[PDB]
């Protein structure tokens, strides 16, 4: 019998051209002939049948005989003849400046860059941030470091520390009385200082590890040619055997009068030179709610305008609960969608501007136009791939209707030497640790010939709302939609974190956890959901249960740590219905 | 035929004989019960189920007798019961199905679970007062003088460090030293304890459990004599007894120890600020307390004579000592040779103790004294079971007062059981007592074969910087498997909540993962030093119920930004530092 996957995938990495076959199917001469044209030897592997099904499953091609070129799977002869007919194959076989060109200095980009060079490969990293419509820009690290997870969590923590001052008093700390205010200017500088240290850290790390970095915006001008333009306007050509597109997304604006003129975004909020003041958040996304949250927590009057539901994609039971709590915490929610934004005042520094927001509200006997004045309006409806000016048409990299790249796993489904990871990969969950993992693993497949795949199912999340929401697996609905109400047990409880027991927090009547189980398969766990302080820290480890098809019986036989919130998952007995 | 069927038959039936192949002397048994007008039901076990059944009940050989749902052993054991007159008394009707001695974690758990299975139950709690005369209500050690108050006083200490963080994040707090009022904290705490005490007392009445606030002693084979506070003495009778008395603080045979020093029992209800404080002992209790006492502003000293946290990973213990040292706690290897009272505590002010220590100078060794306001004895906790009359029912004890068990069954007496701290070699933890109680009741009254899982129990020490652990220490692992077969993976990190601060904790957070190299880095233990160690550890502990490998941690996607995600990216190997 033939070879196994292991042997195939390493020989594919080692060898310049590889043909992997099962039976001596015709057209294999036709291959050797094709590469004859280019003075190229063609190595060869007889695979076992025992192994065909797996190998095809990994590389994502349908049928038995496979070509690999400089460690990239092309498909069958059908695919190969297109590359040659197009002239691509001739260009591809030529020596190139870099082993791998990475477009994007984000979570995935930097992860991939570090992992690649660890496997001794010549790598170039291109980061450039086209500025917000208000003209905001930033350093190396991408969305998370500069305008995402990092600043957001720090501003959440600020808002929590506010609620902690009040707790301090109930525990006996004699704090001088008088309203305590939050100075925005201090928080903002505090945050931006850390972002600076990260930016610098990442820039160092690349130099320390021998990775070329260019602060230049890149566009494909040939089959293996990026044209890259820097801040000055200087333009260079870069060449590589492989490309990774790790471009991520940018805040979405709606096609409304005054939107791009009058409203800030995620990109702008974390470096504002003024206290945002009376604030309107437009959108139901996790971003809208998370933000909306902390601004109220640092003392601002906050309003959230939604089109229909909060957190579309998340458990709408859990979403409704967040809304009830955030409501009791003085955030105002409304059904409206603005029809126009009008600027009344420009911000100075040290002072915000004034926006008039136009809505159309409905009574019993009429529909009539309404306005309300806010200091600052945050647009937070979505994030979109900005890939038009990339020249993916030049390399023939297919995109979805959204700007996202359609993959065979991380491989462009059209072009075999161009790959994509993180937010820009069609249907990739838009989370930092996913980009990083997808990057690290891909590099280990390409340059080591391992069969390791990133696990994009059962990913734990946390929404950093005023009272945090942690989740893993299916929602109550999805489970019922899929399996039917008669076959789903939901176990749940309410509870009071001990840290809140001697206080009069509104959070005391809102903490809730629940466990969603397949009744016909020993209460196998499909999902869990918790509303609590430190939801992030609780969820992460319990998420590993779903990598083992854990049953409710496994949760019940686990001994608790007391006193913690987490132990509550150890003692669920009440059934939802 | 199989185990299940045997154990249910045993629950259903008054008298059961289980055999595999009949031996003589089995008539001699049925003849014995004939004397009691008693039917003797009978079961043929299959050979396949023999090995399991013996393993569950913990007896060596084939033939098994069960009496009112309790396993007695073979004929050898049965003739003892009859020769002793115990068998005749046992078969008589009794007032209660189960008498529970102790209103603690296990006692109350057991009582609730028993009555849920529709059984007549009596619960006996009484608190013999501290040497200083302190007493308290229902709920036992955890509720009144353990986990609950301790965690609340820890939380107080943390909120202190949070005020300082609030300022670095931009909260304008009026400047001037902020002091903590002990009297407020103490009343805050004791109010919650009151609500718990009252809650539990109600819950028993709500659920139809008889509660007697009376100290119990065995005066017959099936008779407890119980004395209440007034001095009134009552007789209680039952078919079964659960002993769940737990432990009490240990004092040394040193002049003035009991006179001059307080304990855990006294500390959480002190009418005074403890002031300058000496903690005697290296136990988790000594350190946890020393911790929060320093955190609310007191001058704290810890006297230990040997290692810290004996039983715990001495790497992690050393790390805690350095941190607690940087936080102003003073550690000394002396052991007091006498305590002398200088002042009585009075008028919500503390007293003054003179502590005598033997030190070494250049040419010799000499006596020394130092003055503390308050000395807390944290040597350990011991079983106070002499005045229980376990000698009457012939319940064997270990050299310490703890009850020797066949699992939770007294090894000597088949209708007396023990759980929680007083059960020889039970880990002394609230969730263990509770589980042991809940499960036992389900075994006794349902005939299930479910065992409490006493291996791989997660803990957290609530030191100023929390320590969470599960599984083997790095030492145990090497002792057991040998250095050549143990991988330790580890890393340092900085919780984001601390990034913009000047906290000492920034240079002390550390996690590590202990792995069996020769079995795919199977995980034997993990250890983390961090904020919220309790909440992080709980879920990761379930990994050890599935023999998780390092490869399972690496393929888990993280939640960002959290501390917990650090376990998903360990790459560095400890090389004997
Ligand atoms: C407000 C907010 C909060 C978030 N909070 C969380 C959270 O709590 N947890 C979490 O897991 N995720 C969170 N996310 C999502 C997370 O930040 C992203 O999913 C992640 O950063 C994506 O990484 P990436 O490398 O794929 O893209 P990015 O992080 O966006 O990096 C892409 C980089 O490529 C650069 N680039 C783009 N085009 C070019 C070009 N032509 N040439 C050169 N460089 C180019 C971009 O400017 C950017 O520098 C949050 C996102 C936002 C907006
Ligand atoms: C300071 C401190 C901190 C702790 N922190 C933690 C922690 O953080 N996490 C954790 O998991 N564990 C912790 N523990 C341990 C925990 O308190 C015990 O493990 C747990 O309470 C044991 O419960 P139990 O049911 O075995 O006994 P207990 O809760 O001690 O119940 C025994 C009760 O029975 C009563 N009794 C005794 N004799 C008689 C009699 N003859 N008749 C009637 N009643 C009687 C006693 O007065 C007492 O009320 C801590 C302990 C202490 C002291
Ligand atoms: N007379 C004494 N003086 C000072 N410390 C003491 C003491 N007796 C016990 N301790 C400490 O107080 C702690 C509590 O004792 P313990 O009975 O719980 O020990 P262990 O947990 O090892 O069984 C122990 O760490 C013990 O340290 P040693 O192991 O060095 O004894
Ligand atoms: Au290779
Ligand atoms: Na008890």
Residue numbers in the entry:
A (entry chain B): 10 to 586
B (entry chain A): 12 to 588
What does the publication say?
We also solved the crystal structure of BmTrxR, being the first crystallographic structure of a TrxR from a nematode, which, surprisingly, is a fusion of a large TrxR domain with a Grx-like domain at the N-terminus lacking a typical Grx active site motif. Helminth TrxRs are members of the high molecular weight TrxR subfamily and are selenocysteine (Sec, U)-containing homodimeric flavoenzymes. They transfer reducing equivalents from NADPH to their flavin adenine dinucleotide (FAD) cofactor and, subsequently, to a pair of cysteines located at the si-face of the isoalloxazine ring. From there, electrons are transferred to the mobile Sec-containing C-terminal redox center of the symmetrical subunit, that, upon reduction of its Cys-Sec motif, reaches the solvent-exposed surface of the enzyme transferring electrons to the incoming oxidized Trx.
Auranofin is a gold-containing compound in which the Au(I) is tethered between a thioglucose and a triethylphosphine with a linear geometry. It is a well-known selenocysteine-cysteine interacting compound. Crystals of BmTrxR, were soaked with 500 μM NADPH and 4–5 equivalents of auranofin for 72 h, and the resulting structure was solved by molecular replacement at 3.1 Å. After the refinement process and geometry optimization of the model, an anomalous difference Fourier map was calculated from 40 to 3.1 Å and contoured at 7 σ. Its superimposition on the difference density map (Fo - Fc) contoured at the same σ and calculated on the refined BmTrxR structure without the metal, clearly shows the position of the gold atoms in the asymmetric unit; an electron density associated with the anomalous signal of a gold atom is present on C22 of subunit b. The gold atom is found at the expected distance for a Au–S bond (2.3 Å) with additional electron density detected from the other side of Au(I) with respect to C22. However, the low resolution of the structure and the incomplete occupancy of the metal (∼50%) prevented identification of the ligand. As expected, auranofin, a pan-TrxR inhibitor, also capable of targeting SmTGR, was here found to efficiently inhibit also BmTrxR and OvTrxR.
